[PDB]
Design a protein around this motif. Sequence first.
Motif, PDB file in Angstrom:
ATOM      1  N   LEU B 232       0.807  -0.834   0.176  1.00 54.20           N
ATOM      2  CA  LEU B 232       0.305   0.190   0.535  1.00 54.20           C
ATOM      3  C   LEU B 232       0.670   1.224   0.121  1.00 54.20           C
ATOM      4  CD1 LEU B 232      -2.656   1.116   0.093  1.00 54.20           C
ATOM      5  CD2 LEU B 232      -2.743   1.091   2.799  1.00 54.20           C
ATOM      6  N   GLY B 234       0.852   4.896   0.807  1.00 57.81           N
ATOM      7  CA  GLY B 234       0.549   5.384   1.355  1.00 57.81           C
ATOM      8  C   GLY B 234       0.732   5.104   3.164  1.00 57.81           C
ATOM      9  N   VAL B 236       1.173   3.863   6.577  1.00 56.45           N
ATOM     10  CA  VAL B 236       2.895   4.104   7.590  1.00 56.45           C
ATOM     11  C   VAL B 236       4.401   3.364   7.937  1.00 56.45           C
ATOM     12  CG1 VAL B 236       1.693   2.862   9.385  1.00 56.45           C
ATOM     13  CG2 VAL B 236       3.015   4.528  10.019  1.00 56.45           C
TER      14      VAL B 236
ATOM     15  N   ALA C  31      -0.897  29.238  -1.762  1.00 52.86           N
ATOM     16  CA  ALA C  31      -0.492  28.935  -0.208  1.00 52.86           C
ATOM     17  C   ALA C  31      -1.448  27.727  -0.130  1.00 52.86           C
ATOM     18  CB  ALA C  31      -0.811  29.473   0.660  1.00 52.86           C
ATOM     19  N   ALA C  35      -0.672  23.764  -0.105  1.00 54.30           N
ATOM     20  CA  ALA C  35      -1.043  22.909   0.998  1.00 54.30           C
ATOM     21  C   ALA C  35      -2.500  21.529   0.899  1.00 54.30           C
ATOM     22  CB  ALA C  35      -1.750  24.124   1.946  1.00 54.30           C
ATOM     23  N   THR C  38       0.137  19.429  -0.255  1.00 53.46           N
ATOM     24  CA  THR C  38       0.695  19.157   1.547  1.00 53.46           C
ATOM     25  C   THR C  38       0.389  18.059   2.163  1.00 53.46           C
ATOM     26  OG1 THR C  38       2.196  20.753   1.219  1.00 53.46           O
ATOM     27  CG2 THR C  38       1.779  19.790   2.991  1.00 53.46           C
ATOM     28  N   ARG C  42       0.671  14.274   4.021  1.00 49.13           N
ATOM     29  CA  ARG C  42       1.025  14.619   5.539  1.00 49.13           C
ATOM     30  C   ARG C  42       0.150  12.665   5.919  1.00 49.13           C
ATOM     31  NH1 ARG C  42       0.193  19.484   8.640  1.00 49.13           N
ATOM     32  NH2 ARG C  42       0.657  18.125   9.920  1.00 49.13           N
ATOM     33  N   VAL C  43      -0.473  12.506   5.483  1.00 49.17           N
ATOM     34  CA  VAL C  43      -1.719  11.820   5.927  1.00 49.17           C
ATOM     35  C   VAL C  43      -1.231  10.264   5.851  1.00 49.17           C
ATOM     36  CG1 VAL C  43      -3.944  10.221   6.293  1.00 49.17           C
ATOM     37  CG2 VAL C  43      -3.159  13.085   5.868  1.00 49.17           C
ATOM     38  N   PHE C  44      -0.808   9.042   6.254  1.00 49.20           N
ATOM     39  CA  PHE C  44      -0.502   7.482   6.176  1.00 49.20           C
ATOM     40  C   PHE C  44      -1.324   6.422   6.604  1.00 49.20           C
ATOM     41  CE2 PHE C  44       4.170   8.246   4.449  1.00 49.20           C
ATOM     42  CZ  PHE C  44       4.077   9.331   4.809  1.00 49.20           C
ATOM     43  N   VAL C  45      -1.928   5.522   6.482  1.00 48.22           N
ATOM     44  CA  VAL C  45      -3.484   4.702   6.693  1.00 48.22           C
ATOM     45  C   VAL C  45      -2.511   3.966   7.290  1.00 48.22           C
ATOM     46  CG1 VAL C  45      -5.004   3.344   5.706  1.00 48.22           C
ATOM     47  CG2 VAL C  45      -4.490   5.294   4.469  1.00 48.22           C
ATOM     48  N   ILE C  46      -3.006   3.211   8.418  1.00 49.90           N
ATOM     49  CA  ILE C  46      -2.872   2.221   9.211  1.00 49.90           C
ATOM     50  C   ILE C  46      -3.781   0.850   8.164  1.00 49.90           C
ATOM     51  CG2 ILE C  46      -2.409   1.057  10.930  1.00 49.90           C
ATOM     52  CD1 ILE C  46      -2.702   3.941  12.760  1.00 49.90           C
ATOM     53  N   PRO C  47      -2.626  -0.007   7.466  1.00 51.18           N
ATOM     54  CA  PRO C  47      -4.002  -0.849   7.079  1.00 51.18           C
ATOM     55  C   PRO C  47      -4.395  -2.153   7.404  1.00 51.18           C
ATOM     56  CG  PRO C  47      -1.822  -1.389   6.327  1.00 51.18           C
ATOM     57  CD  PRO C  47      -1.427  -0.095   7.601  1.00 51.18           C
ATOM     58  N   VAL C 236      -7.773  27.123   5.373  1.00 53.36           N
ATOM     59  CA  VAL C 236      -7.288  25.582   5.723  1.00 53.36           C
ATOM     60  C   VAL C 236      -7.644  24.700   4.261  1.00 53.36           C
ATOM     61  CG1 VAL C 236      -9.102  26.185   6.878  1.00 53.36           C
ATOM     62  CG2 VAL C 236      -7.015  23.736   7.460  1.00 53.36           C
ATOM     63  N   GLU C 240      -7.998  18.636   6.196  1.00 53.55           N
ATOM     64  CA  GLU C 240      -7.523  19.074   7.383  1.00 53.55           C
ATOM     65  C   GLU C 240      -9.082  19.039   8.217  1.00 53.55           C
ATOM     66  OE1 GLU C 240      -3.982  18.906   8.624  1.00 53.55           O
ATOM     67  OE2 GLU C 240      -3.477  18.973   6.766  1.00 53.55           O
ATOM     68  N   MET C 241      -9.586  19.524   8.171  1.00 52.58           N
ATOM     69  CA  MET C 241     -10.562  19.650   8.760  1.00 52.58           C
ATOM     70  C   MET C 241     -11.894  18.763   9.013  1.00 52.58           C
ATOM     71  SD  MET C 241     -10.205  23.043   9.859  1.00 52.58           S
ATOM     72  CE  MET C 241     -11.870  22.843  10.920  1.00 52.58           C
ATOM     73  N   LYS C 269      -7.263   7.702   1.768  1.00 49.20           N
ATOM     74  CA  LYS C 269      -7.231   8.828   2.858  1.00 49.20           C
ATOM     75  C   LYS C 269      -8.195   9.855   2.999  1.00 49.20           C
ATOM     76  CE  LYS C 269      -2.300   8.767   1.522  1.00 49.20           C
ATOM     77  NZ  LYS C 269      -0.688   9.752   1.797  1.00 49.20           N
ATOM     78  N   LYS C 328      -2.536   8.023  10.911  1.00 52.92           N
ATOM     79  CA  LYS C 328      -1.637   8.591  11.796  1.00 52.92           C
ATOM     80  C   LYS C 328      -0.601   9.667  10.556  1.00 52.92           C
ATOM     81  CE  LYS C 328       2.666   7.746  14.767  1.00 52.92           C
ATOM     82  NZ  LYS C 328       3.494   8.395  13.676  1.00 52.92           N
ATOM     83  N   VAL C 331       6.124  12.988   8.632  1.00 49.98           N
ATOM     84  CA  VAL C 331       6.222  13.912   7.591  1.00 49.98           C
ATOM     85  C   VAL C 331       7.367  13.988   6.670  1.00 49.98           C
ATOM     86  CG1 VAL C 331       6.982  14.692   9.749  1.00 49.98           C
ATOM     87  CG2 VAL C 331       9.035  13.789   8.357  1.00 49.98           C
TER      88      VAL C 331
ATOM     89  N   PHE D  44      -2.377  28.732   8.860  1.00 45.37           N
ATOM     90  CA  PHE D  44      -3.795  29.644   7.614  1.00 45.37           C
ATOM     91  C   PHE D  44      -5.054  29.610   8.044  1.00 45.37           C
ATOM     92  CE2 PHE D  44      -2.451  26.452   4.229  1.00 45.37           C
ATOM     93  CZ  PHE D  44      -0.721  26.646   4.778  1.00 45.37           C
ATOM     94  N   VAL D  45      -5.970  29.875   7.456  1.00 41.20           N
ATOM     95  CA  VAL D  45      -7.072  30.861   8.234  1.00 41.20           C
ATOM     96  C   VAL D  45      -8.431  30.019   7.795  1.00 41.20           C
ATOM     97  CG1 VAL D  45      -9.321  32.525   8.657  1.00 41.20           C
ATOM     98  CG2 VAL D  45      -6.704  33.123   7.789  1.00 41.20           C
ATOM     99  N   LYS D 328      -6.022  27.525  12.065  1.00 44.50           N
ATOM    100  CA  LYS D 328      -4.539  26.273  12.201  1.00 44.50           C
ATOM    101  C   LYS D 328      -3.654  26.228  11.644  1.00 44.50           C
ATOM    102  CE  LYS D 328      -6.245  21.337  11.648  1.00 44.50           C
ATOM    103  NZ  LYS D 328      -4.618  21.060  10.838  1.00 44.50           N
TER     104      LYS D 328
END
Lengths: 332, 332, 332, 332
Positions: B232, B234, B236, C31, C35, C38, C42-47, C236, C240-241, C269, C328, C331, D44-45, D328
């Motif tokens: 996979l 992505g 972890v 930006a 983002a 980005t 940054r998101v990784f899955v726990i399969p 944002v 992220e929300m 994701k 999870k 970076v 970020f707003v 955020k």
Amino acid sequence: YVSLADLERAARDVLPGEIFDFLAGGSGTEASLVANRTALERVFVIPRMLRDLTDVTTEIDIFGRRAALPMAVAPVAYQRLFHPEGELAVARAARDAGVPYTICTLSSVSLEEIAAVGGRPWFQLFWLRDEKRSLDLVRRAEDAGCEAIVFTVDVPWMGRRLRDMRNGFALPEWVTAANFFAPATWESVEAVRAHTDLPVVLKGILAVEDARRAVDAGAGGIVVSNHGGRQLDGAVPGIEMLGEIVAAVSGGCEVLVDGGIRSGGDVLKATALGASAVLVGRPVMWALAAAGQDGVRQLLELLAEEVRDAMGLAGCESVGAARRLNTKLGVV
Amino acid sequence: YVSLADLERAARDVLPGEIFDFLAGGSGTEASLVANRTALERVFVIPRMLRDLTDVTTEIDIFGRRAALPMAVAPVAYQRLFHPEGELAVARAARDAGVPYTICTLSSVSLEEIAAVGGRPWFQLFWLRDEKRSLDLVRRAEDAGCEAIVFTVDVPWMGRRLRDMRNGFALPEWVTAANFFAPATWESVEAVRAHTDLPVVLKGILAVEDARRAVDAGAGGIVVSNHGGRQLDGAVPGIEMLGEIVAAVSGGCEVLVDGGIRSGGDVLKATALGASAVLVGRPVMWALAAAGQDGVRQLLELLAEEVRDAMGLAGCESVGAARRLNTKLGVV
Amino acid sequence: YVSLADLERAARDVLPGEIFDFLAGGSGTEASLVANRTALERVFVIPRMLRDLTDVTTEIDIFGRRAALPMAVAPVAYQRLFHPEGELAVARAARDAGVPYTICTLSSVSLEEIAAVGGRPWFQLFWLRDEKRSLDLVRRAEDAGCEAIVFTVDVPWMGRRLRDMRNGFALPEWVTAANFFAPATWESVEAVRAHTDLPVVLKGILAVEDARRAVDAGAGGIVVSNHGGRQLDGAVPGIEMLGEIVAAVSGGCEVLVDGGIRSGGDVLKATALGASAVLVGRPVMWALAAAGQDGVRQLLELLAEEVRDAMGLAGCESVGAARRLNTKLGVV
Amino acid sequence: YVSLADLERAARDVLPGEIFDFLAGGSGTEASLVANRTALERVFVIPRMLRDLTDVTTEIDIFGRRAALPMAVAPVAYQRLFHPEGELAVARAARDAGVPYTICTLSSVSLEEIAAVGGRPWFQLFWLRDEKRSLDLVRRAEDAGCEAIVFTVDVPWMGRRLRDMRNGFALPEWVTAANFFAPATWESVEAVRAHTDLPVVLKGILAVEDARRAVDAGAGGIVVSNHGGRQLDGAVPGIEMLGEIVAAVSGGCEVLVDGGIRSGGDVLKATALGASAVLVGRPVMWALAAAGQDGVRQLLELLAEEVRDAMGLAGCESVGAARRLNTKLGVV
Ligand SMILES: Cc1cc2cc3c(=O)[nH]c(=O)nc-3n(C[C@H](O)[C@H](O)[C@H](O)COP(=O)(O)O)c2cc1C
Ligand SMILES: Cc1cc2cc3c(=O)[nH]c(=O)nc-3n(C[C@H](O)[C@H](O)[C@H](O)COP(=O)(O)O)c2cc1C
Ligand SMILES: Cc1cc2cc3c(=O)[nH]c(=O)nc-3n(C[C@H](O)[C@H](O)[C@H](O)COP(=O)(O)O)c2cc1C
Ligand SMILES: Cc1cc2cc3c(=O)[nH]c(=O)nc-3n(C[C@H](O)[C@H](O)[C@H](O)COP(=O)(O)O)c2cc1C
Ligand SMILES: O=C(O)C(=O)Cc1ccccc1
Ligand SMILES: O=C(O)C(=O)Cc1ccccc1
Ligand SMILES: O=C(O)C(=O)Cc1ccccc1
Ligand SMILES: O=C(O)C(=O)Cc1ccccc1
Ligand SMILES: [Mg+2]
Ligand SMILES: [Mg+2]
Ligand SMILES: [Mg+2]
Ligand SMILES: [Mg+2]
């Protein structure tokens, strides 16, 4: 020279590549060498304003005597590699600047010659296979007037210096260990502490419980340090453990830090994180390489100006005030 | 060779580009391939000082037998792609180094030939469409003297290897699956566990509750792994789940980790995060490609020296002591 | 094409620079455009492993009807900019793939023509200065068989598109708003909700309390979105929300997300963070630019394969299972 | 010009290198100069939707009078360095834009001339060695109609400007301090507060307890600021302390911020973090350098449009609404 980085450029120009690499390098992938700088660059100071700066002073008292700055010259072996006057040039400049100078066990000029320069000589010990010989070296240092024993505790053996291996680096025939090894233990610390009334300072502590045990063992100080990134590759920077160690020590010994100090602002950061004083290694050798004794004098004058500048801009009339500054981690 | 990275450079020189890509690549955007390295580079160790290192040993006991290092050779299919002696060269070097060797279901030399090399052969299972055939493969491995069944559980099918697709990569006619597939389930694990008294080790576990279920299912171990970033994209990194999995497992099985181990310091990091042992994949093939059996021997001697160096610098006389080290995350 | 990035390269080759910039660009410093990517990286899955994958299905039910994937084509204005068949080519391919297609208020082919293609057409509304005209547009869409009203709520006016300003970009004379504006308020939402029995989906929600108010207002869904980085620069990313919004909504409406979806792994994701479905914008136009209807078909087949691959590798036989995956942050 | 960055490019073209460096530079390694921008880019707003924007206004009331934007021109010394009309060109444009203009103690045109331009002149004070002279300067400013005293409290002395040192930069003979120094203390603040009924605004506060003490001392406002990175190198950005300072101040004084504002979106971010208003420094000088008074007018019109755009896109009809936005932190 307007920054310590000017001196690094000057030393790279003059020194043979393999000697510059011996000085600059770390162990393994150099992760800890780089992290020493990353860590300081992430720290931001929260300065105070509108305080009385009539009598700003960078002086400290440490091991019973005044020092002009919260800094000492770190133990760096074989200084004749960098300049023909080696340790004597550095110790003369340190003396004149009011900065303690740490004499190495592996100095290329004898410890008695360097102590005879005067100033505030400390002595850095490596444990010898032979308790009796180790203690005789401590006794020589004490007899010669050294004021503290800086017992290096992070070298059961030398780390893997891949630059040196790749360069096939070896000491020139004209550089020797002019004072002439086994892993040290807590029993070795006790043997040294019983052998001398000088303060014993354990250099290379990173774990909080080792800092606590150092106080329990009767150390007068510790140096929170990963040996400039030259020993365990992947060891945490001292600067990242300093605050937790200062809290755990509760004033029970002096807590110094080293690794990556490249400016008076970095000194301020270390102080704000709770250090009693810092050691400075590579920059002193850059100055020695670039211009001998006068180079080291210029470096120490520049660092003194930067420390005074940073302290006053941060509202601190004394190093104790700087230790009460707060900090905030950033991203770089 | 003074680092595992030296061997990567040597293997890139010798191997055909599409075979180097088969070895080096991951799935998709290679996010998990890169993250395996990012994760290890963010971990810093807090070393201990002044401990007795009279008898530093890197040995461990795992599945009832001693291993010389806390490491085994990961299952990597079709090793004749990298060198004409393929699996036999690697298994000979592993045997001589005292390191277990995982024989693949898709080995290019038969499992009985590789087991006859001796040493500590483990066998990696892929589930076949057909419980009876799967169990016969397990029985072959057991009859041939393999000591553990490493059941790969993260391959219901192969991930999307975009380097291979872009290269049009296919096995040369001279490489075959010398031992000659369906998604495995917990029922498949139970069928294997009932068929053999060998320890069953589930490789490719990343979720904490799957690690707990593995213990409940009677696994003797797990490998916390994202398959080197090849399944996979992505997923972890195993290293980022290891500490939480070791805490949840409560000693109920061995917890290994793999993905991105490139030095003895990385082995130390994995141990400090709680691993029983690591698997090493790509670097072993680099050494095989570069210099055959002797290459793999040199790699394992280098890794043994790096592991001993890192352990002693961190104050650890045994792998158990290394597991009690603390760590701190940094930025790189 | 083996990734959506292949299609981006193909579209950059064929499209005029200023049209590629109209498609690719965001507002201000871009930006929020950056983002969006980005955040997903940054998101990784726990399969999960070892689950039954006998009948893996990527289908979902949304607004009463089945869709083949948890995805719809985002509203993107003026598709004849990218290919002469414009919206009809995209809607035909979406229909054939079983994916809903969002018809734009600013479509370059009339909404009735696009709805006549069949499939599952949704209609994206911009509020007109004139409640009566706005509601007539809603009524046209409903009369033509659109299944949902996607009310865009993040465009009181257009953001500052600096690429367009620098390029002096304007619509060619041969592209028009074939269906032929004021800031919308909650009163506008109520007027639409009262005018139609179709589900009203508010697109451009980022604040948790606006998501809650959307449910209270009778919305059938929301799209958590910063408009692909084209509206407020520094808004944002929706991704992220999303988790906080899904928790606050408590199942009270469908929660979609968009911005930066570039693979089936990105769909996974978004699902794992709690989305009901995603919208995909720019990649669909890349495929349209590169190869018309057949290009869009190929894109949707590739995305379907990537979504099925990622779901199964992560142990998910259904999209509902994927929503129960944990994640999870890493970076990059 | 479509962004403030356009003006930076134009000013670099026209100004002599050493004058551009005087304007652009910071102290030391420029860590705080860079961090001012890093900090804003991480914010970020979370915008609000569907609010009434019938009467969007960027106006604020501050120190009893209306301003057209939540912004004032920061005190920047010696503006004749950048354009022959210097301070008069900037003050004319600020007046015409409805923006307060901070007259410097080290202005290259006398404070009475600049105040005679009209508008809303504030006066920035440096403490003179001599309480009586300092207070006479305050009295001159008050007599000339300045509306506030901006007491700079972060300059006990000038920081170490390494660009200036390396350039050997000095004021041209044709630029002078047309109004013609000791460290200020809280006693100096009290002497100013007792000498004038104008609001006293302390500029350069970063510590929360200094912000609280400023309110206790009778300040009408503070500027949370690290002096554009020009004073302590390694001082935290004001933007990173702003939220904690606004909470501690509890409405007891106006809380402004500066450092790195380069767009109306950055103004929105500062407002959302709780600022009453921002100061803008370098961009105003870029506009002055590039095109004199008309340049500054264009800059302020561009900033007004960007602020109105960002506010409305974020659902804010007033600056007070913008202060109630949430934010955020991201990674960039
Ligand atoms: C060439 C070189 C030799 C030595 C030899 C020794 C030593 O025989 N004993 C000891 O106890 N520490 C040493 N050190 C570490 C030093 O004392 C400081 O720990 C670091 O240099 C601080 O970091 P920097 O200021 O250099 O970043 C060395 C550092 C360098 C660069
Ligand atoms: C070319 C190649 C083939 C295989 C085939 C298999 C396999 O038929 N069964 C299995 O169960 N794991 C495999 N793997 C994963 C391996 O066992 C380790 O999980 C990773 O290589 C650890 O990461 P690195 O040490 O490589 O970073 C492979 C890894 C590589 C590079
Ligand atoms: C050229 C272009 C035009 C429009 C016009 C509209 C629109 O008239 N109404 C609307 O409501 N959303 C629009 N959008 C946003 C879109 O619906 C998605 O929000 C983003 O494209 C998702 O991000 P990506 O998948 O593109 O990253 C657009 C996006 C692009 C690129
Ligand atoms: C060339 C230059 C001279 C001065 C002189 C002064 C000054 O005699 N008194 C004062 O109190 N602040 C000053 N400043 C700081 C200024 O008032 C703002 O604090 C920062 O410029 C805000 O950051 P930017 O908007 O520039 O990023 C200066 C800034 C620049 C660039
Ligand atoms: O720094 C070095 O390499 C030295 O020459 C002295 C030394 C030797 C071994 C470990 C630490 C310091
Ligand atoms: O690593 C590979 O690609 C292989 O050749 C063996 C294999 C096949 C499918 C999934 C995992 C490993
Ligand atoms: O995306 C665009 O720019 C468009 O052409 C339609 C539009 C117009 C204004 C805001 C959002 C979308
Ligand atoms: O900004 C400068 O350098 C100036 O010319 C005025 C000044 C002088 C000393 C500190 C702060 C501002
Ligand atoms: Mg140092
Ligand atoms: Mg590995
Ligand atoms: Mg998207
Ligand atoms: Mg500013």
